[PDB]
Amino acid sequence: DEVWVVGMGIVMSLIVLAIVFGNVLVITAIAKFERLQTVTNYFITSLACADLVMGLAVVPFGAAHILTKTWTFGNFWCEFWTSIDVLCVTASIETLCVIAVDRYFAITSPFKYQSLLTKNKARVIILMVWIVSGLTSFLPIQMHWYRATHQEAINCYAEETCCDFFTNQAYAIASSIVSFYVPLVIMVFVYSRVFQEAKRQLQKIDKSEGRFHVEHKALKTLGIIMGTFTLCWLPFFIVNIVHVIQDNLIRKEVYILLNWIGYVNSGFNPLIYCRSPDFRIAFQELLC
Amino acid sequence: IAQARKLVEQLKMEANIDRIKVSKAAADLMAYCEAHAKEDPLLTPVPASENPFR
Amino acid sequence: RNEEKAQREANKKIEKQLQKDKQVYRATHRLLLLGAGESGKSTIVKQMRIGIFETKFQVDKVNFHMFDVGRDERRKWIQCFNDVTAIIFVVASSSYNMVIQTNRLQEALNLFKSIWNNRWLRTISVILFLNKQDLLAEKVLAGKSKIEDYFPEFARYTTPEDATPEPGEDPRVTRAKYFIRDEFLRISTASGDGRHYCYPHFTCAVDTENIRRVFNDCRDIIQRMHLRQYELL
Amino acid sequence: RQEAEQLKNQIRDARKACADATLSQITNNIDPVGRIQMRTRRTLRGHLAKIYAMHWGTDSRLLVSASQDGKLIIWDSYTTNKVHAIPLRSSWVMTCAYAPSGNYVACGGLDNICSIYNLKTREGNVRVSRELAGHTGYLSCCRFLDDNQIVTSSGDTTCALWDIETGQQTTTFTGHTGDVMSLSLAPDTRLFVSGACDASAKLWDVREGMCRQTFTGHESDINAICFFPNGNAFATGSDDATCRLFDLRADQELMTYSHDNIICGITSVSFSKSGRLLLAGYDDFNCNVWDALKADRAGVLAGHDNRVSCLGVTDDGMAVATGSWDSFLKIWN
Numbered sequence: 001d002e003v004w005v006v007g008m009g010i011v012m013s014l015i016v017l018a019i020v021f022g023n024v025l026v027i028t029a030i031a032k033f034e035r036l037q038t039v040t041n042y043f044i045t046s047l048a049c050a051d052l053v054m055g056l057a058v059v060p061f062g063a064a065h066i067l068t069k070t071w072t073f074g075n076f077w078c079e080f081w082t083s084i085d086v087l088c089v090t091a092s093i094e095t096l097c098v099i100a101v102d103r104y105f106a107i108t109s110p111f112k113y114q115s116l117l118t119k120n121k122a123r124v125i126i127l128m129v130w131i132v133s134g135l136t137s138f139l140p141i142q143m144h145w146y147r148a149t150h151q152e153a154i155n156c157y158a159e160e161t162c163c164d165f166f167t168n169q170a171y172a173i174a175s176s177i178v179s180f181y182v183p184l185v186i187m188v189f190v191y192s193r194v195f196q197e198a199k200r201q202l203q204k205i206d207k208s209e210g211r212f213h214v215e216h217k218a219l220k221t222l223g224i225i226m227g228t229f230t231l232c233w234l235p236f237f238i239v240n241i242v243h244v245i246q247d248n249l250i251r252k253e254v255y256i257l258l259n260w261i262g263y264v265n266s267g268f269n270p271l272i273y274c275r276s277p278d279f280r281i282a283f284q285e286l287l288c
Numbered sequence: 289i290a291q292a293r294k295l296v297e298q299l300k301m302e303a304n305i306d307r308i309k310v311s312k313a314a315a316d317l318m319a320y321c322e323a324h325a326k327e328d329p330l331l332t333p334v335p336a337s338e339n340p341f342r
Numbered sequence: 343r344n345e346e347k348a349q350r351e352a353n354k355k356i357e358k359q360l361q362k363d364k365q366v367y368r369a370t371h372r373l374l375l376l377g378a379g380e381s382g383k384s385t386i387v388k389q390m391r392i393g394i395f396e397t398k399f400q401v402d403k404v405n406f407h408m409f410d411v412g413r414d415e416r417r418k419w420i421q422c423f424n425d426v427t428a429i430i431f432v433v434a435s436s437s438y439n440m441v442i443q444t445n446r447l448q449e450a451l452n453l454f455k456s457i458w459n460n461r462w463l464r465t466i467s468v469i470l471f472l473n474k475q476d477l478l479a480e481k482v483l484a485g486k487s488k489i490e491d492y493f494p495e496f497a498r499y500t501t502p503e504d505a506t507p508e509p510g511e512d513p514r515v516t517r518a519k520y521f522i523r524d525e526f527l528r529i530s531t532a533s534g535d536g537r538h539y540c541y542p543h544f545t546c547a548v549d550t551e552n553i554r555r556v557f558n559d560c561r562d563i564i565q566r567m568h569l570r571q572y573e574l575l
Numbered sequence: 576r577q578e579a580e581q582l583k584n585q586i587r588d589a590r591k592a593c594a595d596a597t598l599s600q601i602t603n604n605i606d607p608v609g610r611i612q613m614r615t616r617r618t619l620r621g622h623l624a625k626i627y628a629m630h631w632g633t634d635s636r637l638l639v640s641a642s643q644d645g646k647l648i649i650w651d652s653y654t655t656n657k658v659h660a661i662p663l664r665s666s667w668v669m670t671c672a673y674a675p676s677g678n679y680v681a682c683g684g685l686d687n688i689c690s691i692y693n694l695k696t697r698e699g700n701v702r703v704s705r706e707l708a709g710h711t712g713y714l715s716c717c718r719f720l721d722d723n724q725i726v727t728s729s730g731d732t733t734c735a736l737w738d739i740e741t742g743q744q745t746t747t748f749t750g751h752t753g754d755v756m757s758l759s760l761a762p763d764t765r766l767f768v769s770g771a772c773d774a775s776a777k778l779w780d781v782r783e784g785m786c787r788q789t790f791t792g793h794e795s796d797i798n799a800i801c802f803f804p805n806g807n808a809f810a811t812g813s814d815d816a817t818c819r820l821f822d823l824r825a826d827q828e829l830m831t832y833s834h835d836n837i838i839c840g841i842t843s844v845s846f847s848k849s850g851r852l853l854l855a856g857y858d859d860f861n862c863n864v865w866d867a868l869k870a871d872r873a874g875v876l877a878g879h880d881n882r883v884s885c886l887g888v889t890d891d892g893m894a895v896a897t898g899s900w901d902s903f904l905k906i907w908n
């Protein structure tokens with residue numbers, strides 16, 4: 001009813017504020033202090049920038065849409081907003097994948113890690129990640145390759161007051177794969193290998209110092225790292241692939257709810273990837 | 289043996305010296321600081337026009 | 343005028359040279375050879391080689407740099423060895439009955455306690471080499487001074503349940519070896535908080551595989567540091 | 576040994592009788608300098624590892640720094656440029672100095688050798704001029720009396736006066752029980768004091784070669800030493816949190832600088848041009864600025880990720896640059 005719309009608007013505003021505050025704080029902490037400027041922190045700030053961009057562009061206009069129930073802006077702005085949304089989501093997820101790969105190289109090959117990661121190499125990796133994210137979002141959306149030949153879709157593309165997402169099978173499959181499924185496989189293999197390394201280190205320590213007093217922590221950290229990424233985004237891409245095949249109908253509300261559940265992952269990320277004592281000290285110095 | 293004699297002689301050399309009262313020394317330090325306070329860029333804020341680093 | 347351009351060009355050339363030096367320096371590890379005198383540090387150093395003494399050895403295309411210092415009990419230069427990859431501690435395990443007045447092994451334990459609890463050497467792992475195993479075995483196996491006579495805690499000591507012996511060993515020599523090892527490990531475990539560990543090794547002058555042991559210990563040290571940094575350990 | 580104890584008792588009694596009133600009592604009416612706020616004007620980047628020593632040039636524009644990377648970099652403070660970058664034979668370096676003529680740069684450390692680099696040479700940009708050997712310990716600090724004479728303080732508990740042209744020790748100074756960790760020259764260069772780990776600062780006469788006075792003060796080691804600009808006083812930096820000011824003529828401490836919160840050690844001590852401010856580094860990441868005549872903290876210098884190991888005030892008193900273990904040189908004003 002009337003109260004429900006106000007509640008949804010309040011929740012959306014709170015989510016916007018949380019995402020903006022968290023990512024702005026992370027970026028400011030990384031920028032202000034030269035101590036925090038580290039090769040892995042370049043990936044961290046790339047992820048933070050992607051999350052800030054999404055929470056500033058896609059989330060507020062999406063909330064305005066869901067509350068207003070119509071798109072007031074022009075037909076060009078609908079396509080631009082959709083492209084920005086896809087670009088931000090893809091960039092964030094592939095940056096998570098890159099952070100995971102960096103950790104894999106750090107633990108798996110400790111000697112060679114310090115040599116084959118450099119500031120120039122990190123900048124090249126970040127630029128390549130953003131270019132890959134852009135080609136998946138801007139190139140198909142702007143050149144109308146994502147548009148599908150359906151009666152409802154064709155009607156929607158005509159009237160400028162309606163801005164929804166209707167996509168063809170090919171672009172949907174390709175975007176879902178590139179954005180989420182390849183990063184999922186890479187991250188799973190990475191974190192399985194890193195868990196194996198942490199485990200074997202634990203039994204080596206136990207063998208060395210068993211009698212004296214000196215994998216719960218590793219399991220908890222891996223859960224907090226990967227589970228929140230899997231839980232937030234997996235349902236959305238699953239229902240994407242499902243309704244695109246259209247073998248099982250998916251309601252629009254079910255789609256939007258899962259998409260916003262994926263959106264809040266950007267706000268969740270700073271609490272997962274910025275728990276270091278250095279980051280905590282920087283945050284404490286910045287505010288109070 | 290020989291080290292003890294050297295240490296004793298060294299202590300004897302330092303013992304024979306003239307020491308002025310601490311009041312005079314404190315007055316000298318205060319006078320030096322007061323006299324040279326006008327030419328200390330660190331103590332008083334130098335103008336940004338004359339500051340070389342800014 | 344031209345002075346600014348000359349300074350810019352000189353700074354650019356120096357910056358490029360320093361970038362190359364940065365790559366070369368970060369690609370090479372550093373170790374500290376710290377140990378009591380006459381404990382075999384020279385022999386073990388020559389084994390790795392294959393005012394200060396600097397020897398560079400590489401294994402598996404990884405460059406290791408070792409520095410051995412040579413003058414009093416007080417150590418203020420020890421603050422200069424922060425951020426080293428590992429501190430290699432060679433001790434004469436055979437010297438349980440010697441005058442160094444004081445037992446040499448007890449002096450080595452005091453040195454280990456001083457190094458472990460030093461504020462500057464915190465987060466630095468120590469690779470421990472119990473050198474001169476053969477002399478210790480010869481002493482303990484033959485009739486000689488009892489460990490209990492010099493170390494009172496040896497009387498109540500027993501072989502640990504791990505009991506990992508070599509291919510050929512005696513119960514008495516194994517008991518003495520493990521007691522000496524757990525003395526150092528007991529000194530190590532209490533003060534540590536998981537940042538730095540102690541790696542014990544029983545080595546002899548005959549053995550020549552210490553390169554592999556040092557390489558594996560350094561690999562484990564860096565892996566554990568990386569794992570604890572990310573909070574997975 | 577009985578005569579030595581009697582002499583020490585007589586010296587202590589004479590010092591106690593000479594002390595009429597503490598410097599704190601006399602400086603009561605002096606107005607405080609007030610709060611001092613200092614900002615990092617320029618930050619110097621390029622050092623690979625932690626920095627121990629620094630020295631400001633006589634031109635008040637050029638400074639040289641030493642790091643464990645083996646690079647001895649000469650910076651242009653005004654333009655934030657690298658004038659020179661000198662490699663070193665030994666990676667471990669604990670000291671550096673810059674000659675008053677601006678042509679020579681001294682270096683040393685765990686290598687047990689003081690090395691002098693000729694900046695005036697044109698056939699080679701930078702090269703070793705002399706390999707001054709004879710010390711059996713690490714060189715804690717080196718300073719230049721002139722373009723040809725240099726004094727070093729090593730871990731052999733001895734300070735020595737070297738002659739660069741000949742390359743051998745002209746004179747050696749003995750008497751310290753522990754390692755010598757710092758050294759500073761008086762403005763007239765005829766005298767200098769060296770702090771030691773023996774919890775005692777000794778004053779030496781260069782020409783005579785004989786120790787003149789010894790100040791006990793605190794009980795921990797002395798890491799930092801520096802004369803007053805007048806030349807009749809100096810301050811020490813202890814491993815304990817106390818910084819103390821001694822007077823040569825009164826032959827006793829005048830005032831001690833300490834705070835309840837501070838428990839860390841001191842690594843570097845220098846005076847302002849007028850001597851009103853005693854800028855002292857700390858094992859804590861932040862630096863401190865003390866009012867010399869009143870023992871009242873004026874300002875705090877912060878912004879270093881690691882401990883501050885170097886500090887210096889330029890000749891004209893325009894700027895202060897502190898070199899910390901964070902491999903960064905920050906110039907304050």
Ligand SMILES: CN[C@@H]1CCc2c(ccc(O)c2O)[C@H]1O
Nearest residue numbers: 082085086089090165175176179
């Ligand atoms: C408008 N919402 C979009 C629609 C499709 C899509 C999203 C995110 C990542 C992708 O790879 C996509 O293909 C969603 O945020």
